[PDB]
Design an enzyme around this catalytic site. Structure first.
Site, PDB file in Angstrom:
ATOM      1  N   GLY B  12      -9.694   5.026 157.287  1.00  0.00           N
ATOM      2  CA  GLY B  12      -9.911   6.286 156.815  1.00  0.00           C
ATOM      3  C   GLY B  12     -10.481   6.021 154.907  1.00  0.00           C
ATOM      4  N   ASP B  13     -10.667   7.284 155.060  1.00  0.00           N
ATOM      5  CA  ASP B  13     -10.928   7.566 153.259  1.00  0.00           C
ATOM      6  C   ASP B  13     -11.960   7.230 153.260  1.00  0.00           C
ATOM      7  OD1 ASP B  13      -8.935   9.186 153.780  1.00  0.00           O
ATOM      8  OD2 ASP B  13      -7.523   7.897 153.385  1.00  0.00           O
ATOM      9  N   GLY B  15     -14.426   8.820 152.678  1.00  0.00           N
ATOM     10  CA  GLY B  15     -15.841   9.466 151.886  1.00  0.00           C
ATOM     11  C   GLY B  15     -17.087  10.425 153.116  1.00  0.00           C
ATOM     12  N   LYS B  16     -16.024  10.939 155.111  1.00  0.00           N
ATOM     13  CA  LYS B  16     -16.837  11.715 156.032  1.00  0.00           C
ATOM     14  C   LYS B  16     -16.820  13.073 155.321  1.00  0.00           C
ATOM     15  CE  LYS B  16     -13.447   9.966 158.491  1.00  0.00           C
ATOM     16  NZ  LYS B  16     -12.278   8.960 157.267  1.00  0.00           N
ATOM     17  N   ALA B  39      -6.104  13.862 159.059  1.00  0.00           N
ATOM     18  CA  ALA B  39      -7.211  13.719 158.183  1.00  0.00           C
ATOM     19  C   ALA B  39      -7.438  15.102 157.007  1.00  0.00           C
ATOM     20  CB  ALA B  39      -8.242  14.704 159.072  1.00  0.00           C
ATOM     21  N   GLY B  40      -7.858  14.312 155.798  1.00  0.00           N
ATOM     22  CA  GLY B  40      -7.788  14.770 154.567  1.00  0.00           C
ATOM     23  C   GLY B  40      -9.313  14.649 153.939  1.00  0.00           C
ATOM     24  N   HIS B  41     -10.303  15.899 154.324  1.00  0.00           N
ATOM     25  CA  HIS B  41     -12.081  15.283 153.829  1.00  0.00           C
ATOM     26  C   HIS B  41     -11.938  16.052 152.501  1.00  0.00           C
ATOM     27  CE1 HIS B  41     -12.055  14.041 158.517  1.00  0.00           C
ATOM     28  NE2 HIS B  41     -11.542  12.940 158.125  1.00  0.00           N
ATOM     29  N   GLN B 224      -9.958   9.846 160.910  1.00  0.00           N
ATOM     30  CA  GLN B 224      -9.227   8.324 159.877  1.00  0.00           C
ATOM     31  C   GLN B 224     -10.460   7.252 159.970  1.00  0.00           C
ATOM     32  OE1 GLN B 224      -7.294  10.347 162.994  1.00  0.00           O
ATOM     33  NE2 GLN B 224      -7.100  11.344 160.525  1.00  0.00           N
ATOM     34  N   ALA B 299      -5.857  12.097 150.625  1.00  0.00           N
ATOM     35  CA  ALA B 299      -5.455  13.907 150.169  1.00  0.00           C
ATOM     36  C   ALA B 299      -4.842  14.686 150.903  1.00  0.00           C
ATOM     37  CB  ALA B 299      -7.165  13.988 150.529  1.00  0.00           C
ATOM     38  N   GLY B 302      -0.618  12.698 149.870  1.00  0.00           N
ATOM     39  CA  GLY B 302      -0.427  12.616 148.294  1.00  0.00           C
ATOM     40  C   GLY B 302       0.065  11.401 148.168  1.00  0.00           C
ATOM     41  N   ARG B 304      -0.293   7.352 147.137  1.00  0.00           N
ATOM     42  CA  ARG B 304      -1.299   6.521 146.176  1.00  0.00           C
ATOM     43  C   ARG B 304      -2.013   4.948 148.118  1.00  0.00           C
ATOM     44  NH1 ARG B 304      -2.761   1.896 144.701  1.00  0.00           N
ATOM     45  NH2 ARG B 304      -2.593   1.160 142.107  1.00  0.00           N
ATOM     46  N   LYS B 331     -19.119   5.413 146.899  1.00  0.00           N
ATOM     47  CA  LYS B 331     -18.192   4.613 145.340  1.00  0.00           C
ATOM     48  C   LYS B 331     -18.402   3.571 144.968  1.00  0.00           C
ATOM     49  CE  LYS B 331     -14.187   7.275 145.784  1.00  0.00           C
ATOM     50  NZ  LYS B 331     -12.840   7.047 146.318  1.00  0.00           N
TER      51      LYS B 331
HETATM   52  N1  LIG Z   1     -16.467   8.449 142.344  1.00  0.00           N
HETATM   53  C1  LIG Z   1     -16.402   8.901 144.200  1.00  0.00           C
HETATM   54  N2  LIG Z   1     -15.637   9.480 144.686  1.00  0.00           N
HETATM   55  C2  LIG Z   1     -16.295   9.941 145.682  1.00  0.00           C
HETATM   56  C3  LIG Z   1     -17.513   9.765 146.061  1.00  0.00           C
HETATM   57  N3  LIG Z   1     -17.855  10.042 147.497  1.00  0.00           N
HETATM   58  C4  LIG Z   1     -16.413  11.065 147.831  1.00  0.00           C
HETATM   59  N4  LIG Z   1     -15.739  10.538 146.760  1.00  0.00           N
HETATM   60  C5  LIG Z   1     -14.425  11.073 146.651  1.00  0.00           C
HETATM   61  O1  LIG Z   1     -13.152  10.140 147.084  1.00  0.00           O
HETATM   62  C6  LIG Z   1     -12.260  10.250 148.108  1.00  0.00           C
HETATM   63  C7  LIG Z   1     -12.805  10.474 149.244  1.00  0.00           C
HETATM   64  O2  LIG Z   1     -11.218  10.569 150.101  1.00  0.00           O
HETATM   65  P1  LIG Z   1     -10.932  11.563 151.294  1.00  0.00           P
HETATM   66  O3  LIG Z   1     -11.961  12.956 151.021  1.00  0.00           O
HETATM   67  O4  LIG Z   1      -9.380  11.350 151.091  1.00  0.00           O
HETATM   68  O5  LIG Z   1     -11.960  10.387 152.343  1.00  0.00           O
HETATM   69  P2  LIG Z   1     -12.973  11.508 153.659  1.00  0.00           P
HETATM   70  O6  LIG Z   1     -11.445  11.106 154.395  1.00  0.00           O
HETATM   71  O7  LIG Z   1     -13.357  10.082 154.485  1.00  0.00           O
HETATM   72  O8  LIG Z   1     -13.360  12.545 154.091  1.00  0.00           O
HETATM   73  C8  LIG Z   1     -12.286  12.556 147.195  1.00  0.00           C
HETATM   74  O9  LIG Z   1     -11.865  12.153 146.898  1.00  0.00           O
HETATM   75  C9  LIG Z   1     -14.001  11.881 147.758  1.00  0.00           C
HETATM   76  O10 LIG Z   1     -13.773  13.278 147.078  1.00  0.00           O
HETATM   77  C10 LIG Z   1     -18.402   8.838 145.449  1.00  0.00           C
HETATM   78  O11 LIG Z   1     -19.546   8.969 146.082  1.00  0.00           O
HETATM   79  N5  LIG Z   1     -17.693   8.440 143.832  1.00  0.00           N
HETATM   80  O1  LIG Z   2       0.679   9.115 162.966  1.00  0.00           O
HETATM   81  P1  LIG Z   2      -1.084   9.434 161.596  1.00  0.00           P
HETATM   82  O2  LIG Z   2      -0.376  10.698 160.441  1.00  0.00           O
HETATM   83  O3  LIG Z   2      -2.479   9.771 162.601  1.00  0.00           O
HETATM   84  O4  LIG Z   2      -0.703   7.985 161.094  1.00  0.00           O
HETATM   85  C1  LIG Z   2      -0.970   6.767 161.953  1.00  0.00           C
HETATM   86  C2  LIG Z   2      -1.470   6.267 160.257  1.00  0.00           C
HETATM   87  O5  LIG Z   2      -2.890   5.898 160.403  1.00  0.00           O
HETATM   88  C3  LIG Z   2      -2.884   6.448 159.215  1.00  0.00           C
HETATM   89  N1  LIG Z   2      -3.643   7.389 158.961  1.00  0.00           N
HETATM   90  C4  LIG Z   2      -3.665   9.166 159.305  1.00  0.00           C
HETATM   91  N2  LIG Z   2      -4.512   9.453 158.190  1.00  0.00           N
HETATM   92  C5  LIG Z   2      -4.736   9.145 157.788  1.00  0.00           C
HETATM   93  C6  LIG Z   2      -6.575   9.479 157.518  1.00  0.00           C
HETATM   94  O6  LIG Z   2      -7.200  10.857 157.360  1.00  0.00           O
HETATM   95  P2  LIG Z   2      -8.618  11.055 157.143  1.00  0.00           P
HETATM   96  O7  LIG Z   2      -9.504   9.435 157.132  1.00  0.00           O
HETATM   97  O8  LIG Z   2      -9.630  10.885 157.641  1.00  0.00           O
HETATM   98  O9  LIG Z   2      -8.747  11.457 155.618  1.00  0.00           O
HETATM   99  N3  LIG Z   2      -6.228   8.509 156.610  1.00  0.00           N
HETATM  100  C7  LIG Z   2      -6.194   7.307 156.443  1.00  0.00           C
HETATM  101  N4  LIG Z   2      -5.036   7.166 156.511  1.00  0.00           N
HETATM  102  C8  LIG Z   2      -4.705   8.023 157.764  1.00  0.00           C
HETATM  103  C9  LIG Z   2      -1.647   6.853 158.378  1.00  0.00           C
HETATM  104  O10 LIG Z   2      -1.738   7.117 157.063  1.00  0.00           O
HETATM  105  C10 LIG Z   2      -0.574   5.812 159.392  1.00  0.00           C
HETATM  106  O11 LIG Z   2      -0.482   4.322 158.993  1.00  0.00           O
HETATM  107  O1  LIG Z   3      -7.019  11.279 153.729  1.00  0.00           O
HETATM  108  C1  LIG Z   3      -6.589  11.408 154.210  1.00  0.00           C
HETATM  109  N1  LIG Z   3      -4.849  10.545 153.554  1.00  0.00           N
HETATM  110  O2  LIG Z   3      -5.636   9.897 152.636  1.00  0.00           O
HETATM  111  C2  LIG Z   3      -3.940  10.224 154.622  1.00  0.00           C
HETATM  112  C3  LIG Z   3      -2.932  10.268 153.814  1.00  0.00           C
HETATM  113  O3  LIG Z   3      -2.487  11.741 152.868  1.00  0.00           O
HETATM  114  O4  LIG Z   3      -1.676  10.030 154.374  1.00  0.00           O
HETATM  115 MG   LIG Z   4      -9.566  11.431 154.211  1.00  0.00          MG
END
Ligand SMILES: Nc1nc2c(ncn2[C@@H]2O[C@H](COP(=O)(O)OP(=O)(O)O)[C@@H](O)[C@H]2O)c(=O)[nH]1
Ligand SMILES: O=P(O)(O)OC[C@H]1O[C@@H](n2cnc3c(OP(=O)(O)O)ncnc32)[C@H](O)[C@@H]1O
Ligand SMILES: O=CN(O)CC(=O)O
Ligand SMILES: [Mg+2]
Ligand SMILES: Nc1nc2c(ncn2[C@@H]2O[C@H](COP(=O)(O)OP(=O)(O)O)[C@@H](O)[C@H]2O)c(=O)[nH]1
Ligand SMILES: O=P(O)(O)OC[C@H]1O[C@@H](n2cnc3c(OP(=O)(O)O)ncnc32)[C@H](O)[C@@H]1O
Ligand SMILES: O=CN(O)CC(=O)O
Ligand SMILES: [Mg+2]
EC number: 6.3.4.4
Lengths: 431, 431
Positions: B12-13, B15-16, B39-41, B224, B299, B302, B304, B331
């Protein structure tokens, strides 16, 4: 196409076990990717009958490697029961079968719970096959379930097994006022079979990636049928797995882009076993004739199957859900002798609208009515016919009509139980 | 390709949310097909930040129709909370968003249960996002859950809602010695929002079949990442949905054969939030530097994020599971300044074997070690770079190396949060 999918386009029992066995003469692998032992797949070779539940349908062909993929919820008890029976019949299962370490395990408490819940629902019972399918998926999804992988270390397995049963035992005795399931019998029965079960483990997704690249022929064998799909089916009168083509990838690990051809098994008349909407259901001499002539009895529970006319509206949903490539018309020999036959072409919705798409959830099918096209039946026998020439025009016309209404060619026609009573107009493996 | 899939190749996370927003400039639809509000996008347009959870990432583009498909477990409370926030910001959500009547509903008892179970596990807690995702899927699979469709008749919904909560309330008070969830607050909160929620319903699978045929551009937005896949992930430290490409079809109703291009979002360094194996995890100045420089904080919760080097072995499993077409390197600007970087190229298994495929279940990753290739870092800034020419050779070499090791081209490179700080070498929609 190298990767061929064979699934049920209706409510299961369309004739998938027979076609899988037929088509695999050219296959390297046959993969099951969903359901468990709720499935009942009848194979007939030279009049010798075989009914598979959990073991895939390519198990009779020495050249084929049969695989139980991660999507299948695996019952060690059922596996072992079937392995023994097939072995006694000269079929070396252990040599031909492989299985995924990611398959959840179905254990007795899963049957207690299935049963429990099924009683709890009263008249609104799903009509589940009494195998513990539902519960094993709940556990899976819940992340508390056990999987073939957990058997890799017996100590921790008992540790893990003890918690789960404890958990399920509280609910069963305290909530359903049911009898508890004995932790020690379950631990023992399982440990008796672990080593055999364990020896058939392989990294299924990696094997298929490698097979794909070698260009080997792979056949995915569906279980149940489209309208029993946990998501797209007549919820909650459905099975707990995705029976639609999308379950092939999730259930085996092959990238979705590697699905070359999706064969839809189509019965020629409809059947359902279990509760749930059924628009073209027949409750008369003719439906009675259909059950009797097609010997429509559950190959797993023995339950009598509900019969109806072919529902082209329902079928048209399967075409889109499964990205069908072609159909396999099964049991045409069963429509023999009827003065006339009919196809549901549209639905009259309870608010007056004529519609051609199906409702989703069961509740929404409630008062739906079918608009039928009535066609000439035929007296000539089509049983065992191996050529269309041997098919009477009325049969051909019916065939043609199903194509017209769905937009998908019928690539194979089945005129009987035996492997050989079939016409392959177009072989999926070729294209 | 007309049907483009954008999913997370790691945990996950990756950069989708940013790439979905970028690529949709040419799309008619954006479809979410799994997960819920876990999810946190993050989207950044001209420095204006947006974080989506349940609403798809094409919601800011007036031309795009955003769709929540059947695979998504839908929280009415979360939908409404986010709709209001986006509306206040001039984004007419109700006009752009559509949703599937087949989506299960997440209600408060689902959060009580998630929480409950999470406490029950003690130190072996999954680290779930505290949203009620798990429970809503269990219910789904169990055939006791409620779905958007159940709101179509308020009377029966309360009837149905009353049984389920009753059911869940017994377990919560009697088993977890937890506080009960009030049937009446849940019925009320929901009924307050039904009509709005209900107005956005559409037959999603039929809409996509029609879109497919018109040749419209469709983008599927994953949630994810691959290794969190309920089936193929590091069970049980996973999410409850199939996050792999196969979940697109099951989760939306589009035949699997209509997936044209699968874009793998690849972060350049690895992150995990939640417990679970993590071979390339770094616990030192450098991992600390990665978290800090990449502002790696959940996202959604909160929390780490754990950081590590890019794990090409883990990534190679995503390539096969998702039938990747190409990667989007995200990134890279974060690796700026490091003297040197490294890629996990293989795993040293605890029995001595050097292996290049990943273990399946979490337990099996237990003592696995990583073999790394160490490469030159780079001092020049790549932040905001819109051309490879602006990328230093060391960066290019690293890029090249990831391709060599995986066999999949990197079709896009992301040098920052803002939509425009990207290089599209090859646009998926074109081919
Ligand atoms: N420095 C940097 N940050 C990026 C880049 N692409 C995305 N981000 C940031 O990296 C993090 C991606 O986290 P998240 O938004 O939760 O990922 P997602 O769930 O895949 O949409 C976010 O804070 C984005 O704003 C990149 O190319 N460089
Ligand atoms: O029952 P759940 O709440 O789904 O948790 C199960 C496991 O999966 C993780 N997790 C859940 N959503 C996640 C997410 O969304 P995006 O990447 O789309 O932003 N990014 C990263 N990790 C994520 C949780 O941290 C935990 O280990
Ligand atoms: O963007 C998704 N997160 O990093 C998952 C969470 O907050 O646990
Ligand atoms: Mg995310
Ligand atoms: N008369 C007739 N019986 C058939 C034909 N094809 C298959 N059968 C039988 O029809 C039934 C199909 O049921 P079942 O085995 O449960 O279907 P499956 O689950 O799809 O494999 C079986 O009894 C088959 O032996 C056919 O073309 N004609
Ligand atoms: O929890 P479950 O036991 O899965 O039951 C849920 C519902 O689905 C039905 N059902 C289950 N397996 C079926 C099967 O297998 P094959 O077609 O593969 O031979 N064929 C037809 N119907 C089948 C049950 O009758 C019930 O309505
Ligand atoms: O072949 C499968 N059956 O008809 C299902 C059952 O026995 O219930
Ligand atoms: Mg059957």
């Amino acid at each position: 196409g190298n990767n061929v999918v064979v699934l049920g386009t209706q409510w299961g029992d369309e004739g998938k076990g027979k076609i899988v066995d037929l088509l695999t003469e050219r296959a390297k692998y046959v993969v099951r990717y969903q359901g468990g032992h709720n499935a009942g797949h009848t194979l007939v070779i030279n009049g010798e009958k075989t009914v598979l539940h959990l073991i895939p349908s390519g198990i009779l062909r020495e050249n084929v490697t049969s695989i139980i993929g991660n999507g299948v919820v695996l019952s060690p008890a059922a596996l072992m029961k079937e392995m023994k029976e097939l072995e006694d019949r000269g079929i070396p299962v252990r040599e031909r079968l492989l299985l995924s370490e990611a398959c959840p395990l179905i254990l007795d408490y899963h049957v207690a719970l299935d049963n429990a819940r099924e009683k709890a629902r009263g008249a609104k019972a799903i009509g589940t096959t009494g195998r513990g399918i539902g519960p094993a998926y709940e556990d899976k999804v819940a992340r508390r379930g056990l999987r073939v992988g957990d058997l890799f270390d017996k100590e921790t397995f008992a540790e893990k097994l003890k918690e789960v049963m404890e958990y399920h035992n509280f609910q069963l005795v305290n909530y359903y006022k049911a009898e508890a399931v004995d932790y020690q019998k379950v631990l023992d029965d399982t440990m008796a079979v672990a080593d055999i079960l364990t020896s058939m483990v392989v990294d299924v997704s990696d094997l298929l990636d490698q097979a794909r690249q070698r260009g080997d022929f792979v056949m995915f064998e569906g279980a149940q049928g489209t309208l029993l799909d946990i998501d797209h089916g007549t919820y909650p009168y459905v099975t707990s797995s995705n029976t639609t083509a999308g379950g092939v990838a999730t259930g085996s690990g092959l990238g979705p882009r590697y699905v070359d051809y999706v064969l839809g098994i189509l019965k020629a008349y409809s059947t359902r076993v279990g509760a749930g909407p059924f628009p073209t259901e027949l409750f008369d001499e003719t439906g009675e004739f259909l059950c009797k002539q097609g010997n429509e009895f559950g190959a797993t529970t023995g339950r009598r199957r509900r019969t109806g006319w072919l529902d082209t509206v329902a079928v048209r949903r399967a075409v889109q859900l499964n990205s069908l490539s072609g159909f396999c018309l099964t049991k045409l020999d069963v429509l023999d002798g009827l003065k006339e036959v009919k196809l549901c072409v549209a639905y009259r919705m309870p608010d007056g609208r004529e519609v051609t798409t199906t409702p989703l959830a069961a509740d929404d099918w409630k008062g739906v009515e079918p608009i039928y096209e009535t066609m000439p039946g035929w007296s000539e026998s089509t049983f065992g016919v191996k050529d269309r020439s041997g098919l009477p025009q009325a049969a051909l016309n019916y065939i043609k009509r199903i194509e017209e209404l769905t937009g998908v060619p019928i690539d194979i026609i089945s005129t009987g139980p035996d492997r050989t009573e079939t016409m392959i107009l177009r072989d999926p493996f070729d294209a």
